[PDB]
Design a protein around this ligand. Structure first.
Ligand SMILES: OC[C@H]1O[C@@](CO)(O[C@H]2O[C@H](CO)[C@@H](O)[C@H](O)[C@H]2O)[C@@H](O)[C@@H]1O
Ligand SMILES: *[C@@H]1O[C@H](CO)[C@@H](O)[C@H](O)[C@H]1NC(C)=O
Ligand SMILES: *[C@@H]1O[C@H](CO)[C@@H](O)[C@H](O)[C@H]1NC(C)=O
Ligand SMILES: *[C@@H]1O[C@H](CO)[C@@H](O)[C@H](O)[C@H]1NC(C)=O
Ligand SMILES: *[C@@H]1O[C@H](CO)[C@@H](O)[C@H](O)[C@H]1NC(C)=O
Ligand SMILES: *[C@@H]1O[C@H](CO)[C@@H](O)[C@H](O)[C@H]1NC(C)=O
Ligand SMILES: *[C@@H]1O[C@H](CO)[C@@H](O)[C@H](O)[C@H]1NC(C)=O
Ligand SMILES: *[C@@H]1O[C@H](CO)[C@@H](O)[C@H](O)[C@H]1NC(C)=O
Ligand SMILES: *[C@@H]1O[C@H](CO)[C@@H](O)[C@H](O)[C@H]1NC(C)=O
Ligand SMILES: *[C@@H]1O[C@H](CO)[C@@H](O)[C@H](O)[C@H]1NC(C)=O
Ligand SMILES: *[C@@H]1O[C@H](CO)[C@@H](O)[C@H](O)[C@H]1NC(C)=O
Ligand SMILES: *[C@@H]1O[C@H](CO)[C@@H](O)[C@H](O)[C@H]1NC(C)=O
Ligand SMILES: *[C@@H]1O[C@H](CO)[C@@H](O)[C@H](O)[C@H]1NC(C)=O
Ligand SMILES: *[C@@H]1O[C@H](CO)[C@@H](O)[C@H](O)[C@H]1NC(C)=O
Lengths: 305, 214, 181, 223
């Protein structure tokens, strides 16, 4: 809205209460919108007997299509916005402005790939709270979207040439961060919950679990092609993202479930570990949806006025 | 709660002919409707689910139809093994409160057969024990419908007899029936003639079998 | 400095507790910084360690501020130092896995020998004490042998392994045959 | 495909509880949901409840809520039904039944409400009556004659009847038992035979009542 002349402001995308606010809002959105037939949540406080909370409820088959949310200043506060395209998300920003509201953000719940989001305006950007810590998630922001077309018939398609181009740019940014002499390797998820190990998302109100091995199986700066086809599974028994628990939904009713999304970013983790080897391994990650919100909110902060 | 109604209660069909059974729901159950077959002494057997899908091992003469609130089971040519009780089951609601129809009994239609009637006085060993059971047997008749009345000294009896009826005979398609009159030894000795009076489509007039006590 | 002893083939549970009863981000690593297991929000992740297919947590305790590392079917090489990183803090635990076997799983004769072998990880200095049903005591470090079995030695032997002040108990069934003179 | 084998018949006083079981063999236990259905003598099928085995979550018929519990033991592939505060009208054959739900361990679940596999049923008799064997009385004997045995005052069901140790089956009718006002059961077994055969052929009814460990043989003669 209006630029602040000669003003330097510190941003920290990893400690941003806008992220926490958005998170609670999406959890509430899902309560009123995507209701399971049965949901289970653990309760073990007595230290001698557990009592799982079980809720059974009406379970309507409904279309689910995320629409943009705009966050405007909460009472007593103001929203500041960092204008530097390449801003890492943590540190001083010299080009800051005040805005009435954020840009429109679609609250897509997904793992591994970030979908239907904003693209970087210059080069590919990577962000972490601590790059040296192998346990911390790396948020990648692409500067060019990649289409992924999915069907309820059990697969997602991605153009192989575009994906390769994308991987090359990511690896080049990763070696820029971890060493120019490093070989960059992408591998499949090392394990965990199904929602974590596959690229997991919802389409037509159904939960898709697609095998992403073919997307993360290459080596960079070391020395059926046209389309990559990922096998998918639609499931009814789902681990909850909102909190520890499980939900069960009814089977699909539509024989024509079709979605096409733009991949605009990804979530990766680095293997790390003690090694004199001159290579780094990166695997798809995600699961904490706050990282999804961060990927869009990194350039904003709210300040007391 | 969803009420399932089947009709008719009993269906009589001649061997090798077609049978059509009906099931109605008190509200729509979409296609969440199953049909089961049950023979005496055995567990039910699934024939049809999803209103029209045949379960494994079910022959093609069984076909299910309908949706919403009205359903039909058709058996195109009845074989010996198809005579049984048939149940429909609603499973559309959530939370689940699944319900069954009250069943349709499919039995073999044959020509009328009048019963042979036999009467049995109480044994001396039972009389010795202070009670008297008089047994009336109606043997090998068709149709199942029969009326049995007890008269003691021409006095029409009520509330002191019980009946039991066999399953339809696998060889000749008939039924048999017993009616047992029970009275104390004291009441038994206070009367003379004990008579069983039987009415049935196959009899031109009521048949009476009797004996004089002592 | 916390030391936990495990038995080969058994399950073990390593504890990690945060300051408050609430599910937060945690991660378990070994001494070479290899990722074992952690959470991402309310989902479990597993790292590229050799424990992968045998490691788990108990998510029903996460909301209570407990984030355990459970390792099933323990192997000798699972012995290591494990670190749980939670709320900017690091809790460390050394796991030592031991195995104890008899020379023969088949039945022995009176007067025949029994040899027990302790399988242990590199760098452990364990002492062992075994006791037969009759009260026969044998002590050793890696190998313990009785030269002549008595008939009264048939049954369950109880073996205690001592390491770092801590001890773990093995029970081994031995058969010694009777005969008619 | 699963095979379902249920536990044996039960006899209970009103006010008691009962726990019946059903062992599932032959397929992956957690890929099935299991349902209990009861059938009172001479009546139709009544749905009692169903357990989603993988989730360990059971739902019940409204008229039963509160006094029925359905459980499953995955380690023994066994499903249980408990019914508390029993009433005489709980007397019925209780059936365990199940259906395949898809790869539940992989998150696939069709939630099928129909029932493909059935146990053999378990009779549960609920009554104030005490166990007792029958008294057996002759129904003493025209080209064809009728004769039989009256099997009276036993509890509980069932009783079995044969003639001449199983050598005679043609023309035999063993009627379904009736429950007398005394709370005890009664039935007759009859057989039609050539009238010329009386006095030359001997007829014995064999009555077996397993619940009371009782076995009776009764010669039925002309006079
Ligand atoms: O439990 C009542 C409930 O079950 C139904 C069948 O769905 O009736 C069943 O149970 C009755 C009581 O035991 C029986 O008389 C009947 O034969 C049996 O079908 C419904 O009537 C009702 O919703
Ligand atoms: C801002 O910076 C410019 C150039 O560095 C300088 O001339 C000016 O004094 C500063 N202050 C403002 C508010 O213009
Ligand atoms: C917890 O739920 C169970 C149902 O399985 C119940 O038996 C128990 O009494 C409950 N305890 C509490 C906290 O009321
Ligand atoms: C971004 O990253 C670098 C190190 O990666 C950090 O030192 C800098 O202050 C951060 N802020 C900017 C200027 O983007
Ligand atoms: C990003 O910001 C830094 C300092 O915050 C500034 O030096 C630089 O001009 C910016 N980079 C751009 C415009 O890409
Ligand atoms: C701040 O960034 C905006 C947009 O990126 C740009 O228009 C402007 O030149 C920057 N401010 C200055 C004057 O450095
Ligand atoms: C995207 O970024 C890469 C480097 O990260 C750069 O080479 C490429 O030109 C950028 N693409 C566009 C369309 O700006
Ligand atoms: C960053 O991660 C490294 C590797 O685990 C760790 O040693 C270091 O303490 C971390 N830095 C901060 C500031 O947390
Ligand atoms: C995805 O669909 C779009 C049109 O909706 C098409 O242009 C694109 O080529 C598709 N990408 C694939 C199948 O890789
Ligand atoms: C990506 O894969 C393509 C084949 O699809 C291959 O030519 C190339 O080695 C990779 N990218 C580049 C241009 O290095
Ligand atoms: C994905 O597919 C690959 C290749 O077939 C397979 O090795 C891997 O185990 C699969 N991953 C999952 C999550 O099933
Ligand atoms: C990974 O790619 C290699 C060659 O680039 C291929 O041979 C292999 O099948 C792929 N791995 C998996 C697990 O699919
Ligand atoms: C991305 O946007 C497209 C077009 O509006 C939509 O069809 C698709 O469902 C979106 N993807 C997700 C995962 O929401
Ligand atoms: C993805 O982005 C491309 C280029 O901006 C656009 O043409 C296409 O419609 C987008 N797809 C979706 C689903 O938004």
């Amino acid at each position: 809205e209006v630029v602040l002349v000669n003003v330097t402001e510190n941003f920290n995308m990893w400690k941003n209460d806008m992220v926490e606010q958005m998170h609670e809002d999406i959890i509430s959105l899902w309560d009123q919108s995507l209701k399971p037939c049965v949901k289970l949540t653990p309760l073990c406080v007595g230290a001698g007997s557990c009592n799982t909370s079980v809720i059974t409820q009406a379970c309507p088959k409904v279309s689910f299509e995320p629409i943009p949310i705009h966050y405007c200043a909460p009472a007593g506060f103001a929203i500041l916005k960092c204008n530097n395209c390449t801003f890492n998300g943590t540190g001083p920003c010299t080009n800051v402005s005040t805005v009435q509201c954020t840009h429109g953000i679609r609250p897509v719940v997904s793992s591994q790939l970030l979908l239907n989001g904003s693209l970087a305006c210059e080069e590919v950007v990577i962000r972490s709270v601590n790059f040296t810590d192998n346990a911390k998630t790396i948020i990648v922001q692409l500067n060019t979207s990649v289409e992924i077309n999915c069907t309820g018939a059990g697969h997602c398609n991605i153009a192989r040439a575009k994906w390769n181009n994308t991987l090359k740019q990511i690896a080049s940014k990763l070696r820029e961060q971890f060493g120019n002499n490093k070989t960059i390797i992408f591998k499949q998820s090392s394990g965990g919950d199904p929602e974590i190990v596959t690229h997991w998302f919802n389409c037509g109100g159904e939960f898709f679990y697609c095998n992403s091995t073919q997307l993360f199986n290459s080596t960079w700066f070391n020395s059926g092609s046209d389309t990559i086809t990922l096998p998918c599974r639609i499931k009814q028994i789902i681990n909850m993202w909102q909190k520890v628990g499980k939900a069960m939904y009814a089977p699909p009713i539509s024989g024509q479930i079709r979605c096409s999304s733009n991949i605009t970013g990804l979530l990766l983790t680095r293997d790390g570990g003690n090694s004199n080897n001159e290579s780094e391994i990166f695997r798809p990650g995600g699961g904490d949806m706050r990282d999804n919100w961060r990927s869009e909110l990194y350039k904003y902060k709210v300040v007391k006025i | 709660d969803i009420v399932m109604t089947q009709s008719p209660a009993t269906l009589s069909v001649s061997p090798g002919e077609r049978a059509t059974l009906s099931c109605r729901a008190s509200e729509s159950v979409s296609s969440d409707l199953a049909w089961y077959q049950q023979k005496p002494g055995q567990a039910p057997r699934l024939l049809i689910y999803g209103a029209s899908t045949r379960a494994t091992g079910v022959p093609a003469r069984f076909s299910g139809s309908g949706s919403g609130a009205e359903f039909t089971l058709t058996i195109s040519s009845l074989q010996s093994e198809d005579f049984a009780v048939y149940y429909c089951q609603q499973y559309n609601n959530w939370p689940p409160r699944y319900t069954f129809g009250q069943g349709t009994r499919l039995e073999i239609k044959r020509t009328v057969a009048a019963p042979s009637v036999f009467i049995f006085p109480p044994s001396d060993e039972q009389l010795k024990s202070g009670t008297a059971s008089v047994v009336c047997l109606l043997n090998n008749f068709y149709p199942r419908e029969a009326k049995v009345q007890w008269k003691v000294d021409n006095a029409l009896q009520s509330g002191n007899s019980q009946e039991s009826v066999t399953e339809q005979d696998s060889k000749d398609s008939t039924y048999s029936l017993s009616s047992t009159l029970t009275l104390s030894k004291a009441d038994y000795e206070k009367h003379k003639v004990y008579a069983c009076e039987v009415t049935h489509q196959g009899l031109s007039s009521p048949v009476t079998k009797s004996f004089n006590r002592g | 400095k916390k030391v936990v002893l495990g038995k080969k083939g058994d399950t073990v549970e390593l504890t990690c507790t945060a300051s408050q009863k609430k599910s937060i981000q945690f991660h378990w690593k070994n001494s070479n910084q290899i990722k074992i297991l952690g959470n991402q929000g309310s989902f479990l992740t597993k790292g590229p360690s050799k424990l992968n297919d045998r490691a788990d947590s108990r998510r029903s305790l996460w909301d209570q501020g407990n984030f355990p590392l459970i390792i099933k079917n323990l192997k000798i090489e699972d012995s290591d130092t494990y670190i749980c990183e939670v709320e900017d803090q690091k809790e460390e635990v050394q796991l030592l896995v031991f195995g104890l076997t008899a020379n023969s799983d088949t039945h022995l004769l009176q007067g025949q020998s029994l040899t027990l072998t302790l399988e242990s990880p590199p760098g452990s200095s364990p002492s062992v004490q075994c006791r037969s049903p009759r009260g026969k005591n044998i002590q050793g470090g890696k190998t313990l042998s009785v030269s002549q079995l008595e008939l009264q030695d048939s049954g369950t032997w109880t073996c205690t392994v001592l390491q770092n002040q801590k001890k773990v108990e093995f029970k081994i069934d031995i058969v010694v045959l009777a005969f008619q003179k | 495909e699963v095979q379902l084998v249920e536990s044996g018949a039960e006899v209970k006083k009103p006010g008691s509880s009962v726990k019946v079981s059903c062992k599932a063999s032959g397929d992956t236990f957690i890929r099935y949901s299991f349902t209990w259905v009861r059938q009172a003598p001479g009546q139709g099928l009544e749905w009692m409840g169903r357990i989603i085995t993988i989730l360990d979550v059971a739902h019940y018929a409204p008229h039963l809520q509160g006094r029925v519990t359905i459980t499953a033991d995955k380690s023994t592939s066994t499903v249980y039904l408990e019914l508390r505060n029993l009433r005489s009208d709980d007397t019925a054959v209780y059936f365990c039944a199940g259906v395949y739900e898809g790869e539940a361990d992989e998150g696939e679940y069709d939630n099928n409400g129909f029932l493909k596999h059935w146990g053999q049923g378990t009779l549960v008799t609920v009554s104030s009556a005490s166990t007792k064997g029958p008294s057996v009385f002759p129904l003493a004997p025209g080209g064809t004659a009728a004769l039989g045995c009256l099997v009276k005052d036993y509890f509980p069901e069932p009783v079995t009847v044969s003639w001449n140790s199983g050598a005679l089956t043609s023309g035999v009718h063993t009627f379904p038992a009736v429950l007398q006002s005394s709370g005890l059961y009664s039935l007759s077994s009859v057989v039609t035979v050539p009238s010329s055969s009386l006095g030359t052929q001997t007829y014995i009814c064999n009555v077996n009542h397993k619940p009371s460990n009782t076995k009776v043989d009764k010669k039925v003669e002309p006079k």
